[PDB]
Amino acid sequence: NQEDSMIMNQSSIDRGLFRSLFFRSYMDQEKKYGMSITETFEKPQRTNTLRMKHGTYDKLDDDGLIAPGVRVSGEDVIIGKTTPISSKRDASTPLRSTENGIVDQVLVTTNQDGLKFVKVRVRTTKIPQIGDKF
Amino acid sequence: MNAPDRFELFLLGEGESKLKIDPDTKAPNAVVITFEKEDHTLGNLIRAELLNDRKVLFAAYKVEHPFFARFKLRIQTTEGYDPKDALKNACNSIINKLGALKTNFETEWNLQTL
Amino acid sequence: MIVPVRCFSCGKVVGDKWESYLNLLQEDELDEGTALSRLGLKRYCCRRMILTHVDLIEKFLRYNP
Amino acid sequence: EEGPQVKIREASKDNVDFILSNVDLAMANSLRRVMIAEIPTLAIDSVEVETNTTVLADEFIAHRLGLIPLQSMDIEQLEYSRDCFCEDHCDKCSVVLTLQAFGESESTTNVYSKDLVIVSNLMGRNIGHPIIQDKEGNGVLICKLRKGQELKLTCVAKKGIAKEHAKWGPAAAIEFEYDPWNKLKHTDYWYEQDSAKEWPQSKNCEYEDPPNEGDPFDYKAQADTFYMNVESVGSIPVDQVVVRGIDTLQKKVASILLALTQMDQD
Amino acid sequence: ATLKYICAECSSKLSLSRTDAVRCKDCGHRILLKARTKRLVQFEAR
Ligand SMILES: [Zn+2]
Ligand SMILES: [Zn+2]
Ligand SMILES: [Zn+2]
Incomplete structure (x- = not known):
């Protein structure tokens, strides 16, 4: 506990002392690039899709989204997207590599001009660790 | 994330003996027992009992770092007496003391009406 | 939000005592310090658990879905 | 003596x-x-959540379920799953608890440690009973539900020591x-x-x-x-x-x- | 069985597919949710 450090009762931490919820929200648009080129929400197939993420795409339902409730982890693909140009490059959204958790909620919408866009919430519970500031 | 599994505190590792008895170089008839997956609970208990043994010249234990559940216990005895035997006797004495403690608590508890 | 089961410091179950405490205050008019003590919460670690709780859940329930 | x-x-x-x-x-x-x-002691260690319409998080609830005290009288005749010979858990090493709750009432519906039900075979041993010290006989308040608020989950309680978890x-x-x-x-x-x-x-x-x-x-x-x-x-x-x-x-x-x-x- | 998407306010299930119209049946509101996976999630109670 020297030089501004402190000791925590690991017993208390287990009992719920200082735990917290954590929610991050990932967004993605289905953009329209002119008269012909349109991005798509789907599960990319590795044969006809370039520059795929090394992460896994299995947690995607055929609409290109993970259903809420699935547990995720680093580098995994939350939102599947392709930007057709010619067959098509991979424009998917992976979960931050330094994080993990369970998907809390996933919503599908259109905006002011009607571009399909989807928001994904991810919930983790952060339990007080060592370099944690108080 | 860099957090070790909680069972690592008590559950022995792959090919890891509870005891590792190494001999002390610096002193005659002295030894160093490393106790894996153990803490103060046992260390201070044993050390204090070896102190009661008259034929025991030196006894001390230390938890070299708190991230690891292990402790080094150093035993030095008079010539002819073996430190492993010293440890064996102190271990036994402790058990026999606890045996009486249980018996005595049990008897006293049974007398209570609450 | 929502009464902690077990006091953080010693782990005495405090999960059952909530409604009982809130009752000893409305129904019995009793002051906080006596109600806590009635409920057998003697150590201040246990006392602080109930005494300083904010049951936010009750607001959370006010939203429809 | x-x-x-x-x-x-x-x-x-x-x-x-x-x-x-x-x-x-x-x-x-x-x-x-x-x-x-x-x-x-015996304490809930795995929580499989089928449905949760509550204001609380799956894991928030899950955490509480571990802190609910369970009858550990005959804990000594239960095996640690680690030492047990199955694949995950069984009767020789675990107690299966079930919890189904729903807001039928217009008023706030409460979820208690009493609302837990044992689904595993107990081998006739004093184990896994949610400890109720409560005067009104409810035990620990796990959750609060409103109307269409449903909570459907399954608990696997396992033998353990405070060194692993408090x-x-x-x-x-x-x-x-x-x-x-x-x-x-x-x-x-x-x-x-x-x-x-x-x-x-x-x-x-x-x-x-x-x-x-x-x-x-x-x-x-x-x-x-x-x-x-x-x-x-x-x-x-x-x-x-x-x-x-x-x-x-x-x-x-x-x-x-x-x-x-x-x-x-x- | 099967509820592809749920409604934000009225909470009525929807089950729609690609190019069906992003709106609810009765209420207007284009909000709409996703409904939990049927692949049941397990958590350690620690
Ligand atoms: Zn306390
Ligand atoms: Zn088993
Ligand atoms: Zn609607």
């Missing part, structure tokens, strides 16, 4: 006040440590004192004018003779006689917190004797 002696002062379902004489402080403490940390801690606070008159000179009393006036006299002062100023310091004097109070959470009865504590420490020492025994072979 023999070696160290006990003299119980008060008893209940929840507390044991006693005096431990003819013992080493090291022993009194080692027992105190074991009671807190090494006595096995949920398997069968004891609440353990009171521990010795030498209520500082005869041993084990503390240097901080004061402003008088340490005797400034520092409150212990309860246990009555169970010991005051030092009487006109006497020299007893250096030869050693620490024996310990005024303790063991508080139970429910899982195990107060007496068995003491007994099982004595026994665990005894078993812990036996392992060392045995280890030395296996080492003698080579």
Whole structure:
């Protein structure tokens, strides 16, 4: 506990002392690039899709989204997207590599001009660790 | 994330003996027992009992770092007496003391009406 | 939000005592310090658990879905 | 009778006040440590969530379910799943609990530790019963639901110790004192004018003779006689917190004797 | 059985597919949710 450090009762931490919820929200648009080129929400197939993420795409339902409730982890693909140009490059959204958790909620919408866009919430519970500031 | 599994505190590792008895170089008839997956609970208990043994010249234990559940216990005895035997006797004495403690608590508890 | 089961410091179950405490205050008019003590919460670690709780859940329930 | 002696002062379902004489402080403490940390208990360890329409998070709830005390009387005839021979869990190593709750009422619907139901075969052993100390007989308040608020989940309770998680801690606070008159000179009393006036006299002062100023310091004097109070959470009865504590420490020492025994072979 | 998407306010299930119209049946509101996976999630109670 020297030089501004402190000791925590690991017993208390287990009992719920200082735990917290954590929610991050990932967004993605289905953009329209002119008269012909349109991005798509789907599960990319590795044969006809370039520059795929090394992460896994299995947690995607055929609409290109993970259903809420699935547990995720680093580098995994939350939102599947392709930007057709010619067959098509991979424009998917992976979960931050330094994080993990369970998907809390996933919503599908259109905006002011009607571009399909989807928001994904991810919930983790952060339990007080060592370099944690108080 | 860099957090070790909680069972690592008590559950022995792959090919890891509870005891590792190494001999002390610096002193005659002295030894160093490393106790894996153990803490103060046992260390201070044993050390204090070896102190009661008259034929025991030196006894001390230390938890070299708190991230690891292990402790080094150093035993030095008079010539002819073996430190492993010293440890064996102190271990036994402790058990026999606890045996009486249980018996005595049990008897006293049974007398209570609450 | 929502009464902690077990006091953080010693782990005495405090999960059952909530409604009982809130009752000893409305129904019995009793002051906080006596109600806590009635409920057998003697150590201040246990006392602080109930005494300083904010049951936010009750607001959370006010939203429809 | 023999070696160290006990003299119980008060008893209940929840507390044991006693005096431990003819013992080493090291022993009194080692027992105190074991009671807190090494006595096995049954507690919810896996929570599979089928439905949750609540205002609370799946894991928020999950966490609470572990802290709910379960009957661990016959905990000794249950195996640690790690040591058990199945694939995950079974009857020989676990207790399966079920919880289905729904807001039928226009008023707030409460979810209690009483609402837990055992689905696994108990092998007729005193285990996995949610401990209810509650006057109204409800036990721990897990959750609150409104209308269409449903909570459907499954719990797997497993044998464990407080070292792995504090949920398997069968004891609440353990009171521990010795030498209520500082005869041993084990503390240097901080004061402003008088340490005797400034520092409150212990309860246990009555169970010991005051030092009487006109006497020299007893250096030869050693620490024996310990005024303790063991508080139970429910899982195990107060007496068995003491007994099982004595026994665990005894078993812990036996392992060392045995280890030395296996080492003698080579 | 099967509820592809749920409604934000009225909480009525929807089950729609690609190019069906992003709106609810009765209420207007284009909000709409996703409904939990049927692949049941398990958590350690620590
Ligand atoms: Zn407390
Ligand atoms: Zn099994
Ligand atoms: Zn609607």
